[PDB]
UniProtKB/Swiss-Prot annotation, chain A:
Disulfide bonds: none annotated. It comes from Homo sapiens. Component of the ATP synthase complex composed at least of ATP5F1A/subunit alpha, ATP5F1B/subunit beta, ATP5MC1/subunit c (homooctomer), MT-ATP6/subunit a, MT-ATP8/subunit 8, ATP5ME/subunit e, ATP5MF/subunit f, ATP5MG/subunit g, ATP5MK/subunit k, ATP5MJ/subunit j, ATP5F1C/subunit gamma, ATP5F1D/subunit delta, ATP5F1E/subunit epsilon, ATP5PF/subunit F6, ATP5PB/subunit b, ATP5PD/subunit d, ATP5PO/subunit OSCP. Subunit b, of the mitochondrial membrane ATP synthase complex (F(1)F(0) ATP synthase or Complex V) that produces ATP from ADP in the presence of a proton gradient across the membrane which is generated by electron transport complexes of the respiratory chain. ATP synthase complex consist of a soluble F(1) head domain - the catalytic core - and a membrane F(1) domain - the membrane proton channel. These two domains are linked by a central stalk rotating inside the F(1) region and a stationary peripheral stalk. This is ATP synthase peripheral stalk subunit b, mitochondrial. Signal peptide: none annotated. It is found in: Mitochondrion; Mitochondrion inner membrane. The chain holds residues 150 to 203 of 256 of the full protein. It comes from the Eukaryota. The modification N6-acetyllysine is found at K5, K13. Belongs to the eukaryotic ATPase B chain family.
Swiss-Prot record, chain B:
It is found in: Mitochondrion membrane. It comes from Homo sapiens. One of its GO terms (biological process) is proton motive force-driven ATP synthesis. One of its GO terms (molecular function) is proton transmembrane transporter activity. Subunit 8, of the mitochondrial membrane ATP synthase complex (F(1)F(0) ATP synthase or Complex V) that produces ATP from ADP in the presence of a proton gradient across the membrane which is generated by electron transport complexes of the respiratory chain. ATP synthase complex consist of a soluble F(1) head domain - the catalytic core - and a membrane F(1) domain - the membrane proton channel. These two domains are linked by a central stalk rotating inside the F(1) region and a stationary peripheral stalk. This is ATP synthase F(0) complex subunit 8. It comes from the Eukaryota. Its main location: mitochondrion. Keywords: Acetylation, ATP synthesis, Cardiomyopathy, CF(0), Disease variant, Hydrogen ion transport, Ion transport, Membrane, Mitochondrion, Primary mitochondrial disease, Transmembrane, Transmembrane helix, Transport.
Length: 54, 51
């Protein structure tokens, strides 16, 4: 009986794998978005200050 | 020897035939030794979950 109950508790906690998949996907796409932001920002400022420096 | 008065032999044979092949054997057949109780506290294969 107690083994059955423990199995029930584990299979209750089951959903963490799926929500971790969720978290990883969300974080990955957010990181990519902010990386694009900084890519374009950095490079246009690079062109601008290239002109300034020359 | 009286053991050789062969006119009293049937009355010695037949009740022995009874009491040895019928009555004692029934008295035994009602004596049975049950196998000892082996309460195996370990009988659990349910499964894991599908995962």
């Amino acid at each position: 009986i107690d083994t059955e109950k423990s199995q029930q508790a584990l299979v209750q906690k089951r959903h963490y794998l799926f929500d971790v998949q969720r978290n990883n996907i969300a974080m990955a796409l957010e990181v990519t978005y902010r990386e694009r932001l900084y890519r374009v920002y950095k490079e246009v400022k690079n062109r601008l200050d290239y002109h300034i420096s020359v | 020897m009286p053991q050789l008065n062969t006119t009293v032999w049937p009355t010695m044979i037949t009740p022995m035939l009874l009491t040895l092949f019928l009555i004692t054997q029934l008295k035994m057949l009602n004596t049975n030794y049950h196998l000892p109780p082996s309460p195996k506290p370990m009988k659990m294969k349910n499964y894991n979950k599908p995962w």
